[PDB]
Design an enzyme around this catalytic site. Structure first.
Site, short mmCIF file in Angstrom:
data_model
loop_
_atom_site.label_atom_id
_atom_site.label_comp_id
_atom_site.label_asym_id
_atom_site.label_seq_id
_atom_site.Cartn_x
_atom_site.Cartn_y
_atom_site.Cartn_z
N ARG A 343 35.37 58.04 42.59
CA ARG A 343 34.73 57.22 41.58
C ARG A 343 33.22 57.28 41.76
NH1 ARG A 343 36.98 51.38 41.25
NH2 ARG A 343 36.67 51.37 43.53
N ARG A 349 32.94 46.35 33.98
CA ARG A 349 32.92 44.93 34.29
C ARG A 349 32.09 44.61 35.53
NH1 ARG A 349 37.96 45.63 36.73
NH2 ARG A 349 39.17 44.97 34.88
N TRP A 468 40.55 40.99 34.73
CA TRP A 468 39.66 40.99 35.89
C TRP A 468 40.40 41.54 37.11
CZ3 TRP A 468 40.06 38.84 40.72
CH2 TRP A 468 38.94 39.07 41.54
N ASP A 470 42.53 43.87 38.69
CA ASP A 470 43.01 45.23 38.43
C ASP A 470 44.50 45.39 38.68
OD1 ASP A 470 40.81 46.81 37.50
OD2 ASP A 470 39.93 46.63 39.50
N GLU A 615 44.51 41.84 46.14
CA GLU A 615 44.83 40.90 45.08
C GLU A 615 46.02 39.97 45.34
OE1 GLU A 615 44.18 44.24 44.51
OE2 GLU A 615 42.17 43.96 43.69
C1 LIG Z 1 45.62 46.79 45.97
C2 LIG Z 1 44.67 47.83 45.56
O1 LIG Z 1 44.67 48.84 46.13
N1 LIG Z 1 43.87 47.46 44.52
C3 LIG Z 1 42.76 48.28 44.04
C4 LIG Z 1 41.70 47.44 43.26
O2 LIG Z 1 41.13 46.45 44.12
C5 LIG Z 1 40.59 48.44 42.82
O3 LIG Z 1 39.61 47.70 42.10
C6 LIG Z 1 41.19 49.55 41.87
C7 LIG Z 1 40.18 50.56 41.43
O4 LIG Z 1 40.69 51.55 40.58
O5 LIG Z 1 42.31 50.20 42.59
C8 LIG Z 1 43.38 49.37 43.07
O6 LIG Z 1 44.08 48.76 41.96
C1 LIG Z 2 34.58 48.71 41.89
C2 LIG Z 2 35.78 48.08 41.34
O1 LIG Z 2 36.74 48.93 40.41
N1 LIG Z 2 35.97 46.78 41.68
C3 LIG Z 2 37.06 45.92 41.28
C4 LIG Z 2 36.65 44.83 40.25
O2 LIG Z 2 36.20 45.42 39.04
C5 LIG Z 2 37.93 44.00 39.93
O3 LIG Z 2 37.53 43.00 38.98
C6 LIG Z 2 38.45 43.32 41.25
C7 LIG Z 2 39.71 42.53 41.07
O4 LIG Z 2 40.87 43.32 40.91
O5 LIG Z 2 38.66 44.35 42.28
C8 LIG Z 2 37.57 45.22 42.60
O6 LIG Z 2 38.04 46.25 43.60
#
Ligand SMILES: CC(=O)N[C@@H]1[C@@H](O)[C@H](O)[C@@H](CO)O[C@@H]1O
Ligand SMILES: CC(=O)N[C@@H]1[C@@H](O)[C@H](O)[C@@H](CO)O[C@H]1O
Ligand SMILES: CC(=O)N[C@@H]1[C@@H](O)[C@H](O)[C@@H](CO)O[C@@H]1O
Ligand SMILES: CC(=O)N[C@@H]1[C@@H](O)[C@H](O)[C@@H](CO)O[C@H]1O
Ligand SMILES: [Ca+2]
Ligand SMILES: [Ca+2]
Ligand SMILES: [Ca+2]
Ligand SMILES: [Ca+2]
Lengths: 779, 779
Positions: A343, A349, A468, A470, A615
């Site tokens: 990335r 966001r 928010w 992910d 999360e």
């Molecule tokens: C549990 C885990 O690995 N979560 C991460 C999330 O925090 C991150 O922002 C995202 C980016 O693409 O990838 C995954 O969903």
């Molecule tokens: C750099 C990046 O993709 N950061 C994400 C953020 O955008 C998201 O809101 C949060 C909650 O899942 O987790 C972070 O890892």
């Protein structure tokens, strides 16, 4: 257990012992050349794009953080050698004393060992795309000493992927050549004379040099014991192909008490190396450059300074958190010791939220990022989740669209204009990522209309790919968090339209906001548990209820219901009380509870994540500041401060054995109560937590808010605070704010006087350069 | 200077000193589980897909090849420790004697140090997806010794990219749990009970264990000095998140002269670890497994054995080159110490060519790869340059199409059927990669027709994206190499159609071939220099002429003009004489000369490559065997052997200081005369040079060729050879060939007798299990 302390006077964090349980990093650079460097000088540099313009290599996720920007010292009488940074040589800590001072955009390394004092200051000077290594060596023994100094960096093949793989190509893609005090590294396939060349130069005229990594380090050796350093001389290697390095050597003879100074320079572009090595031979030019770096941050820090009963808050707001927040705005989120490839560019966001934090200190970069985001938005109204701003500097489908991305941009744009007064910004025409153009104002409406359209039959915003969180993928499902964000965005936009006299938009969006509130208050409140649910699955099942066994209470929904201004005071307090009782811990607020343990794709990937991790049940830092804001809006300053103190890295300076990560930096998440490492902090620096924490404290706890027509001061502090003071620079004028709390309340302004004269409400923007005394009495 | 020697008796290469200037690797595994291991036990394992199913980690392109599959031994009386492999502990070579025996699909590591003899045999047993570490420890001192053994592997997050980056995700994607003698590694996001679990088990009942890398290695330590090994005990760590390892420890008390045996097992899938650790507690099961590995290769080697005056040729053909060629066919080209991520699956032209080399030894895998390639071909007729065979196991445009890819498949398919006799294969229906299906026969015609269509106005095949030489991008330009390949493919197909009685196709393609020959002989010959040009730019400028200053003589065009059978004997000899005079070196034949120094995109990326490197003036190994074949067709056996001896790794066993790479393996390329490292060999193992070298020697120098109706023996050897003998297994029958050269000629068969009876021409295929004596007299 601690490894250092905050030096408030010099705005530096002093590391007294280098054997920290993890690399404690700092960021060098304020323009295009950046360096992520650790207290052990491990790390790397890159120019503009970390993914395609890495300058020096980095082997991540290993027990050692190598390679790095090292300086090896050798006693040519005994053959003994050590590095100015503890690692990589790792001289015994019973023999050598090490000290590291991480400052704003510079790091000072110090080593006192067996009669030799050595200092090395690494910093990227403004105006140059290079890193200066200011080295000072002093003979503190009572005899003549002969000391040789060796530099070392392993040049990158520029594309991170080329460093990690595809060596069948990259091993023959570059070469080194030597000229007096300059190792020139040529990326043979990059024809650009600037970007296609790196260099390592020295202000001194070398005794020897090495451009080939295999020759400097030697066979079956590594950075800990380079062959060149052990034998006391380089092999003067330089050729095309294989792995290259930048090692320049010089022997010095030092009389007792005598000290010498010289510099190494790591940089980009042909011609610059020869120029800068010559420029810095006059050490006064190094001092001037360093002075510009100090000025850079002095100027920014001075725009908002606070003096309060909380030393932790003061220390962080006055320097560290401002620094971390602006670092995110400038360098984005993809260059650290955790983000090391893949990335790159801007996360929609992420930057949309970051940009709301420091418009008072760096309005230019804030405007630049806002424009990047506007260019990264499509006609439909949503934003490209991840994109490179350079692509649009003069496209994914709805399936890869995240439902919240574009909404965060609204409050951020309004804040930028409130802060700078650049009301003309709304009329500027900006092209959409997928063709066509529209005014900033219309871009904003396109965003608000998108969320109004993408809702369920109950009127709640669809989670789409993810909100928010992910790991919350509802697709056709609905997210409480997005609907609350939509309301907040709408309230911000309504105030704007009202200010611009756009009566029709005021009616349209006020109506839209009304519907969002009724829908949320009607469907998202759980009257059995006393809180707001997280959302609903695509099949209509509520997520986050008092009757479920897993994931009952959620931080995002409950904090945003209040922050957005949607929830009533009554529901707000009860929901936040549920947050305190079930999510609070001495380390901060958990994202949810209980943690999920049963996979369920109707809820999302969060049900497939380890309990207490990321999360799923961890202390996800980002949302914590929202809880502080929520509490200030509820008028519970003591509650807000309890949350702040628990997450504040400063207060964990002496529990490193548990925290592990930097005590001067917010992290993405801390292991939750459900994980055996509960308390360990992960991913410092590049987290939106810093921008939000700064925004929450300055604008809601201290209550200083810039507005379209005036400056507002409406604090929510602990009832025992006798008061506090803030110096606020807004639109070229200074506001010296003094808050008095004689009746010991938490929130509520009895009176405000401007320059001795009582006023009602907002402080009208004063003349350029004026200094105004503002006395606020709570009561 | 040498570091080992060939042990012909045991079919192993013995490394006598571990401080080789580079990692000398070997491949373990013959089915799905594979391990690339070095003489220092550095390396990694993967299952099926190296890109998505890596089992243990690997930090590539560094001074040390780590991590690896290590066994640490510790004297619990003194605390002294060392590894069975020299690295990572690297005990002084003045104190410890190390020996490594690389065999076919197994590697034996030995260490004799201060009264303790230790052996470790790493091999992947057939029938299991795991690696056995057969360890033997013997007390050779005169006192009771107490020795502890520790294992170590760092488990991979399975996707190479996840090991190299995106740790914000991968660091919380797995965990370890422990059960008696078994560390279970769970890839939490991979729900498959087989692929989503790895393990490290021990036949002994552990005294301690470690599943967390940070605990085993310790803070600020690495594989060279693990904390657990130094303190003499693991910390019994196991948890979710962070980096995991597989370390099992056991202390042994050994009486003087006493020896013990036990095994460690690295594998995949739940349930297997507990099973195999128990299975191998009976060492007889380890011996049976090892015996199956010996049998596997004994069976293959016995199908073609040669006895000649050239020991180097014999040693390589009878084992090493067969081994390397089949390794390419089975494991493809993307898993080594050079290929460590990104590209994965099958390279069309690579496997298409590899598959022609060992159908006599591994017909099953050959057929499988041919079918993969047929499935990877599109209706248009061209092949997908790079694809994963699993995608099509029951698509790019013409712009990414390489002009030669599909053509190599023709001679390969014909050879497969000639070898096995499976003539029914031509009727099998196979789907095209882009939809639809056709018989194998029609797939072949689709390929031939494509090249007939994609030619220039002169009738020469377009280079398109690139021909054999990836750095030759002519697009609309024309390639001599492709036209010659087309002719060869056509000649092969004509013989097939003739054999199948497809008269119409015989006429069609014979005519097509006629036009290719006339076009090539008319436009590609340079009568000033006496050779064939490389091709023409899109603007019609000839490339490779006697008048140009750079890139005059090219190896591919000149060797293929002869190999394909297109060029006359006269032009053939002269062109090859130009190759000898201007391209030959003691290290092999350069790809072109002089090297290019002026960038020119009309010619290709080769003009932007360093001189003497890769495609630009280096000794590119792959095409060298074509030169041998060319020479045999010209009847110049002495010339052919001069070329063979120069490139044969075997003959460079004592010039490692210059060669650097494995003396038992062909490499992609050797630095050419224009580079200061001229002679250094790069990228061993996974190069098509091995398959081609094997094919050239067995089929053209020794002249043994399977055919649609009979076996042919028509050698081209050095005139001084008194003769030679070959044992050839073909279609279930054995042919004991004896070649006599009383008149000392190079080529030309005077007579051939089958079982004492004189015959004319091809040897008809004999009955299953029959042993036939074939006497060939040259004259
Ligand atoms: C549990 C885990 O690995 N979560 C991460 C999330 O925090 C991150 O922002 C995202 C980016 O693409 O990838 C995954 O969903
Ligand atoms: C750099 C990046 O993709 N950061 C994400 C953020 O955008 C998201 O809101 C949060 C909650 O899942 O987790 C972070 O890892
Ligand atoms: C000079 C150079 O780096 N050439 C390589 C070539 O050998 C390799 O086969 C190809 C694979 O995609 O990439 C590059 O063209
Ligand atoms: C694995 C791979 O893509 N190998 C290529 C081969 O196909 C090509 O014919 C040759 C000449 O350019 O170079 C090799 O690197
Ligand atoms: Ca360049
Ligand atoms: Ca002023
Ligand atoms: Ca699993
Ligand atoms: Ca027989």
């Amino acid at each position: 257990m601690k490894y250092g302390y905050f030096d408030n006077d010099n705005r530096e964090y002093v590391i007294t012992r280098p054997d920290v349980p993890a690399p404690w990093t700092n960021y060098l650079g304020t323009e295009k050349f950046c360096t992520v460097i650790s207290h052990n000088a491990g790390g790397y540099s890159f120019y503009n794009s970390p993914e395609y313009n890495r300058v020096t290599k980095f082997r991540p996720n290993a027990t050692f953080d190598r390679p790095g920007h090292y300086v090896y010292l050798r006693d040519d009488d005994s053959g003994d050698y050590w590095s100015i940074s503890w690692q990589p040589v790792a001289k015994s800590l019973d023999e050598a004393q090490y000290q590291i001072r991480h400052g704003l955009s510079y790091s000072k390394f110090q080593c006192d060992y067996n009669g030799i004092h050595a200092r090395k200051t690494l910093f990227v000077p403004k105006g140059e795309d290079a890193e200066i290594w200011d080295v000072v060596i002093k003979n503190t023994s009572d005899q003549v000493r002969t000391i040789s100094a060796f530099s070392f960096v392993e040049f990158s093949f520029s594309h991170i992927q080329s460093d990690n793989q595809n060596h069948q190509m990259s091993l023959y893609s570059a070469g080194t050549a030597y000229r007096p005090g300059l190792i020139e590294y040529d990326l043979y396939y990059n024809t650009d004379d600037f970007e296609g060349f790196y260099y390592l130069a020295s202000t001194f005229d070398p005794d020897s040099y090495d451009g080939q990594r295999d020759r400097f380090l030697g066979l079956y050796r590594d950075e800990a014991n380079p062959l060149a350093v052990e034998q006391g001389r380089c092999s003067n290697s330089a050729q095309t192909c294989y792995n290259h390095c930048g090692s320049l050597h010089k022997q010095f003879t030092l009389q007792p008490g005598e000290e010498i100074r010289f510099a190494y320079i790591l940089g980009i572009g042909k011609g610059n190396g020869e120029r800068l090595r010559e420029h810095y031979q006059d050490v006064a030019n190094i001092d001037a450059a360093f002075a510009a770096i100090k000025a850079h941050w002095d100027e920014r820090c001075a725009k908002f300074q606070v003096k309060s009963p909380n030393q932790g808050l003061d220390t962080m707001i006055n320097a560290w958190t401002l620094y971390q927040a602006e670092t995110c705005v400038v360098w984005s989120r993809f260059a650290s010791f955790i983000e090391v490839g893949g990335r790159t560019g801007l996360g929609y966001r992420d930057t949309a939220q970051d940009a709301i934090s420091v418009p008072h200190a760096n309005p230019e970069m804030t405007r630049k990022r806002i424009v990047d985001l506007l260019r990264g938005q499509v006609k439909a109204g949503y934003g490209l989740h991840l994109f490179d701003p350079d692509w649009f500097d003069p496209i994914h489908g709805i399936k890869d669209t995240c439902s919240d991305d574009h909404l965060w941009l609204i409050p951020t744009i309004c804040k930028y204009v409130m802060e700078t007064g650049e009301t003309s910004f709304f009329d500027q025409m900006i092209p959409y990522a997928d063709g066509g153009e529209a005014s900033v104002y219309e871009h904003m409406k396109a965003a608000l209309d998108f969320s109004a359209e993408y809702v369920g039959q109950t009127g709640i915003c669809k989670g789409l790919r993810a909100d928010w969180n992910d790991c919350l993928n509802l697709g056709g499902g609905e997210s409480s968090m997005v609907s609350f964000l939509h309301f907040w965005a709408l309230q911000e936009f309504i105030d704007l339209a009202k200010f611009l006299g756009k009566d029709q938009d005021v009616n349209t969006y006020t109506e839209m906001a009304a519907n969002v509130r009724e829908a949320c208050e009607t469907h998202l409140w759980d009257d059995e548990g006393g809180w707001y649910i997280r959302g609903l699955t695509k099949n209509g099942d509520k997520i986050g209820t008092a009757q479920q066994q897993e994931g009952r209470v959620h931080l995002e929904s409950n904090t945003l219901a209040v922050l957005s201004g949607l929830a009533s005071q009554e529901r707000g307090e009860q929901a936040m009380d549920a947050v305190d009782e079930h999510l609070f811990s001495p380390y901060g607020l958990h994202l949810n509870a209980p943690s999920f343990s049963t996979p369920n794709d109707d809820i999302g990937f969060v049900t497939r994540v380890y309990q207490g991790v990321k999360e799923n049940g961890a202390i996800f830092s980002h949302p914590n500041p929202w809880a502080w804001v929520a509490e200030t809006k509820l008028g519970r300053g003591d509650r807000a401060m309890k949350f702040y103190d628990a997450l504040n890295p400063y207060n964990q300076n002496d529990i490193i054995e548990k925290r592990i990560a930097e005590p001067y930096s917010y992290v993405q998440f801390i292991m939750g109560r459900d994980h055996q490492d509960h308390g360990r902090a992960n991913h410092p620096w590049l987290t939106g937590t810093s921008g939000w924490a700064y925004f929450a404290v300055t604008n809601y706890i201290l209550g200083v808010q810039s507005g379209f027509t005036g400056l507002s001061v409406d604090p929510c502090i602990p009832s025992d605070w006798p008061g506090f003071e803030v110096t606020r620079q807004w639109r070229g004028a200074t506001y010296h704010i003094q808050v008095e709390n004689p009746d010991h309340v938490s929130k509520g302004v009895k009176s405000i006087t401007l320059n001795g004269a009582p006023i009602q409400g907002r402080i009208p923007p004063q003349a350029q350069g004026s200094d105004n005394q503002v006395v606020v009495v709570l009561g």
